[PDB]
Design a binder for this molecule. Structure first.
Ligand SMILES: Nc1ncnc2c1ncn2[C@@H]1O[C@H](COP(=O)(O)OP(=O)(O)O)[C@@H](O)[C@H]1O
Ligand code: VO4
Ligand SMILES: [Mg+2]
Length: 697
């Protein structure tokens, strides 16, 4: 321990998390006090416990790889990212195995084809940090050893996962260009964004669905096609928006083109006319021309082989959903509801979908009950009627979304042997709002599973591979999130208790919430009940604490539509609509659990390439560095731990018999002619990075 005078250390600070302090007097070993001199000139005696993190030299700060730091601690990482980002305007930085990517919130001219080819053929460390380098390394490893790869981006909402994923795919399309199948696989993104992304208060272009795109390659490592897997689309988005949030983009693209002659038969108007698009109070995104976006969407559909007739059919479905949302449901007393058959919006809804308005009006306000002994028809209250109507709207959109993805996959098919593939994962990031519900619970659960997949490959596997070789290895501590995962997915867990309540015909949100209280309050450290609420619960996620409201958990987990309404659309004279509701028990939560299990396995059977995205500020400001919010994300992603294990990891390994050519004691002797840059195991030798390539020369 030598904290000599004149050098600097980091101490806690409220605003900037950490602050530098110069050691005024030299350090006497064992002393509890430290003579420091603050930046303001205020002297102090810091109560240390033999201690403060040492600040790295100004020569080592700002480097491309943070493993090159002398003192690996949180202040160093935070400080290095700050000056690289805030001052040097560098958004990419290497943190060992992972790439770190800071959201610039500004268009940077660093993705041109010239730069793409500049990265091609190069090694990982040869060039400055860039998403292209991560992609190149995956493409490089796919070719040299015929292994499937995965580009796995992560981070909270608005951190820049989708932008990273698309640029990674842009790289593959450029270097591995063969038919221009490359332009089609790239086109799959903007299509799914139009029908799958929506403005939230976290991100103007938030992904409300998860995607995993497998890019297939032939023996020449040229792209031959691709396949897209989607995960739980947000259905409530179709019929509900919070303040300053929008429905899916395509609804507004469609309304913005309502007066075009081609669309006039859809009887549309401004987005402010329709209840399903107006609810947020703002129908426009700053710096987005929805009409111009409609044009690009049409061009993109055409590029994928979807002509005018195909586009008008999906636009017809979309317009129908909007009109459905404006069907007037009046109250008849306090126990009954009513819809006029001559309701204007109902009539076009039925015309576009070839339905009979009488049957729709009837079964929006009544529910049939078959007991195989009698058939009871009970009226619905106005709230129940609106609910049944909205549920129908959400169902139509869900089928339409699946229909589009299914057709996209058909367009990207290939009649050939898949040599290898590179999967690009891009799911909705960790998010939390004032009011969190089932939607947020699922997204955060998904993110929890990704962190598990990450920790397993980076910390569990890598260290276990070293430990069982009998080599000296100080284990790196990392936050294992298996407990919170078990709390959610395992038996007697939250999602299991929810399914049980859903099986009860008299099941309710309140009773389910009570079963969570009894089972987990003062029983599971990760589960908490707020003192000033008996309608919610808070979970300690890896990223942050998140309070969830229990309202609507059963309904959303069931995700049902009344039988009579389904039959009406099943008898649709519109071929596309009839296809959606043709006849061909498990809950949303159970399906979501199972889907994610398959995904994790698919990722584990590939060589992962991780990218950690980070939102620097909450105001979408260009190159603004919010220390508190950033350090929170660095802790959640375990960046500091990742850098540490990356630093002390031995990249190159040799078996003893292999070592002789260039026995156990003979090799150890010749190696000495420092002692830290290699270690000897049971059947293997290991070396430090680049500490051998100089022998090759
Ligand atoms: N590299 C970047 N360059 C410019 N803008 C970016 C970049 N990354 C993110 N952004 C901005 O952040 C917004 C949201 O990014 P996105 O990738 O959708 O985040 P996520 O998918 O993680 O929610 C984008 O619409 C874009 O304006
Ligand atoms: O806002 V993002 O859902 O695309 O993480
Ligand atoms: Mg996204």
């Amino acid at each position: 321990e030598l904290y000599t005078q004149y050098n600097r250390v980091w101490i806690p600070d409220p605003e900037e998390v950490w602050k530098s302090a110069e050691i005024a007097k030299d350090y006497r070993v064992g002393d509890k006090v430290l003579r420091l001199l603050l930046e303001d000139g205020t002297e102090l005696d810091y109560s240390v416990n033999p201690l403060p993190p040492l600040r790295n030299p100004d020569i080592l700060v700002g480097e491309n790889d943070l493993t090159a730091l002398s003192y690996l601690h949180e202040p160093a990482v935070l400080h290095n990212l700050r000056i690289r980002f805030a001052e040097s305007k560098l958004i990419y930085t290497y943190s060992g195995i992972i790439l770190v990517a800071m959201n610039p919130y500004k268009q940077l001219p660093i993705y041109g084809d010239a730069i793409i080819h500049a990265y091609s053929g190069q090694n990982m460390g040869d060039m400055d940090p860039h998403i292209f380098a991560v992609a190149e390394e995956a493409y490089k490893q796919m070719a040299r050893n015929n292994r499937n790869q995965s580009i796995i981006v992560s981070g909270e909402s608005g951190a820049g996962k989708t932008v990273s994923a698309r640029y990674a795919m842009r790289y593959f399309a450029t270097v591995s260009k063969s038919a221009h199948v490359e332009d089609k696989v790239l086109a799959s993104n903007p299509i799914t964004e139009a029908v799958g992304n929506a403005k939230t208060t976290r991100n103007d272009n938030s992904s409300r669905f998860g995607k995993y795109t497998e890019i297939s390659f032939d023996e020449q490592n040229q792209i031959i096609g691709a396949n897209m897997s989607t995960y739980l689309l947000e259905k409530s988005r179709v019929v509900f928006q919070s303040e300053n949030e929008r429905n899916y983009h395509i609804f507004y693209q469609l309304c913005a083109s309502a007066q075009q002659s081609e669309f006039k038969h859809l009887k549309l108007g401004s987005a402010e006319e329709f209840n399903y698009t107006r609810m947020g109070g703002n129908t426009v995104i700053e710096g987005v021309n929805d009409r111009a976006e409609m044009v690009e969407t049409q061009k993109t559909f055409t590029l994928l082989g979807f002509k005018e007739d195909f586009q008008m059919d999906v636009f017809k479905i979309l317009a129908a959903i909007l009109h459905l949302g404006n069907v007037q449901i009046t109250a008849v007393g306090n126990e009954r509801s009513s819809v006029s058959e001559d309701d204007s919006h109902l009539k076009v809804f039925c015309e576009l979908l070839g339905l009979e308005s009488g049957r729709v009006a009837q079964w929006l306000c009544n529910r049939k009950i078959v007991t195989s002994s009698e058939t009871v028809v009970k009226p619905m209250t106005r709230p129940q009627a609106v609910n049944a109507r909205d549920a129908l709207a959400k169902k139509i959109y869900a089928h339409l979304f699946d229909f589009i993805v299914e057709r996209i996959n058909q367009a990207l098919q290939f009649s050939g042997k898949q040599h290898t593939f590179i999967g690009v994962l891009d799911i909705y990031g960790f998010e939390t709002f004032d009011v969190n519900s089932f939607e947020q619970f699922c997204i955060n659960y998904a993110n929890e599973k990704l962190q598990q997949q990450f920790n397993m490959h980076v910390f569990k596997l890598e260290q276990e591979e070293y430990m069982k070789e009998d080599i000296p290895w100080t284990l790196i501590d990392f936050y294992d999130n298996q407990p919170v995962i078990d709390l959610i997915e395992a038996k007697m867990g939250i999602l299991e208790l929810l399914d049980e309540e859903c099986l009860l015909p008299h099941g309710t949100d309140e009773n389910w919430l009570q079963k969570l209280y009894n089972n987990f309050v003062n029983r599971n450290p990760l589960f908490e009940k707020p003192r000033m609420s008996n309608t919610s619960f808070v979970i300690q996620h890896f990223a942050d604490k998140v309070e969830y409201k229990c309202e609507g958990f059963l309904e959303k987990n069931r995700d049902t539509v009344y039988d009579m309404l389904v039959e009406i659309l099943r008898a649709s004279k519109f071929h596309l609509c009839a296809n959606f509701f043709q006849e061909n028990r498990t809950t949303v939560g159970s399906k979501f659990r199972s889907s994610l299990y398959l995904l994790m396995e698919t990722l584990n059977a590939t060589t992962p390439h991780y990218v950690r995205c980070i939102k620097p500020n909450d105001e979408k400001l260009p190159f603004e560095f919010d220390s508190k919010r950033i350090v929170q994300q660095l802790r959640a992603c375990g960046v500091l731990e990742t850098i540490r294990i990356s630093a002390q990891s031995y990249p190159s390994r040799w078996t003893y018999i292999e070592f002789y050519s260039r026995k156990k004691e003979v090799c150890k002797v010749v190696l000495h002619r420092d002692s830290n840059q290699y270690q000897f195991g049971k059947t293997k030798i290991f070396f430090r990075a680049g500490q051998v390539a100089y022998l090759e020369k």
